[PDB]
Amino acid sequence: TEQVMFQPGHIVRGIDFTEDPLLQGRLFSYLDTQLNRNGGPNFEQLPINMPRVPIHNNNRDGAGQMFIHRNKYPYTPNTLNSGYPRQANQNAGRGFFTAPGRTASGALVREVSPTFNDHWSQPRLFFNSLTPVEQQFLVNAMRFEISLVKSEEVKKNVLTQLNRVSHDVAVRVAAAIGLGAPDADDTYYHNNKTAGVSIVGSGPLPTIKTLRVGILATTSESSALDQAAQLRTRLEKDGLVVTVVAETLREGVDQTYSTADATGFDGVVVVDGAAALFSSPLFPTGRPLQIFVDAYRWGKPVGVCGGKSSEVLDAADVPEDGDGVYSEESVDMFVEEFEKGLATFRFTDRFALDS
């Protein structure tokens, strides 16, 4: 992974470049930068960089040269190696070739084409294509970042740019930093939307294999471990990665509360035999509960399995009828409902929206 040296200049017959000025310059950079990384010019000879076909060329020497070349006439044209290696092109040897309809015309210029000048309509196209909750998240991210800019001329400059994309984004962002947004400038406003760019709107996940389920249990109650084991078996036969957490490690317990965290799971389940945990020298205060509250507040499916759920829900301040909140006595009926929540992945109704 560390030594792999990618290059857009590694191209094959049948593909070609375009005159995109960003692409064009990248072609120079990747060839040059591997000199820095490898410290010598023979970086294509590293295993991960080698091709899987024979190499026939007149490149020679350099620090780290791994090859011992037989051909002692590495120049073209030659007769002393019978004209080999032969030149490859469009008509012979399956040569790379530039697309023959490409042309250039005009002055040699260091100028920006005017066709590149609209910087605002597509960011607006993008913003219009996100759901209301996704819109809030994007606004919240900007409020987070721009609130940490010390320069009060930089924040004003940022609002000016955002304003040309969307007045509403500008106003909502400015509210977090106590500055007024500038007046609407609708040259680039529009209402078009486009498919495929929204995450929250691309449906439930088409699969839940590998998703991670944290089962919060206890060693005080041997029935809590039984409830967890039962829950383990039925989750694992659907390919979820299941972690049973308790106070200490023992058979059937994967992690301790001390190392467990809500970022470690895509769904959190409490077995109702463990309800008491919801102080100790073995984990920080409030840890088992905090795992539950965090997963809840981050929009993850959460639940209590076994039938007594109100002690847990009440302590967590999680409503029993909330979307993404599961309480069932039967393990089987629990898993079926919970697995739908895992596919939904995030329960977006737990986050507030600007009016």
Task: Enumerate residues 27-86 that contact Ca ion by CB under 5 A.
Answer: 39
Residue 78 near residue 85, CB atoms below 8 Å: no
Coil vs helix vs strand at 37: helix
Spacing of C-alpha 336 from chain mean position: 28
Per this entry, what is the length of the chain?
355
Residue 325 near residue 303, CB atoms below 8 Å: yes
Q: How many residues contact Ca ion, by CB under 5 A? A: 1
Decide whether 66 or 99 has the Cβ nearer to Ca ion: 66
Binder to another protein among 102, 190, 193, 340 (CB under 8 A)?
102
In angstroms, give the least distance from the CB of 179 to another protein. 16
In angstroms, give the least distance from the CB of 259 to another protein. 21
- Chain position carrying tokens 């469009």: 90
DSSP string, 241-290: EEEEEESS--TT--EETTT--GGG-SEEEEEGGGGGG---TTS-TTHHHH
Decide whether 14 or 281 has the Cβ nearer to another protein: 14
Using rule CB under 8 A, residue 205 touches another protein: no
In angstroms, the CA 44 to CA 41 distance is: 8
Decide whether 58 or 136 has the Cβ nearer to another protein: 58
Site for another protein in 17-36 (CB under 8 A): 17, 24-25, 27-28, 31-32, 35-36
Site for another protein in 151-180 (CB under 8 A): 151, 153-154, 157
In angstroms, give the least distance from the CB of 161 to another protein. 12
Instruction: Give which of 210, 222, 167 is closest to 190, Cα–Cα.
Output: 167
Q: Please state whether the peptide bond connecting residue 47 to the residue before it is cis, i.e. omega within 30 degrees of 0.
A: no
* Long-range Cβ contact pairs of 233-236 (< 8 A, separation 24 or more): 234/331, 234/332, 234/335, 235/335
In angstroms, the CA 265 to CA 269 distance is: 10
Using rule CB under 8 A, residue 147 touches another protein: no
In angstroms, give the least distance from the CB of 58 to Ca ion. 15
Using rule CB under 8 A, residue 108 touches another protein: yes
Decide whether 46 or 175 has the Cβ nearer to Ca ion: 46
In angstroms, the CA 256 to CA 216 distance is: 10
Decide whether 66 or 148 has the Cβ nearer to another protein: 66
Decide whether 84 or 201 has the Cβ nearer to another protein: 84
Site for another protein in 61-100 (CB under 8 A): 61-82, 84-89, 92-96, 98, 100
Using rule CB under 8 A, residue 239 touches another protein: no
Using rule CB under 8 A, residue 13 touches another protein: yes
Coil vs helix vs strand at 148: coil
Instruction: Give which of 32, 37, 71 is closest to 54, Cα–Cα.
Output: 71
Choices 1-9, 115-123, 128-136, 193-201; region in contact with another protein by CB under 8 A: 1-9
Decide whether 75 or 191 has the Cβ nearer to another protein: 75
Binding region for Ca ion (CB under 5 A): 39
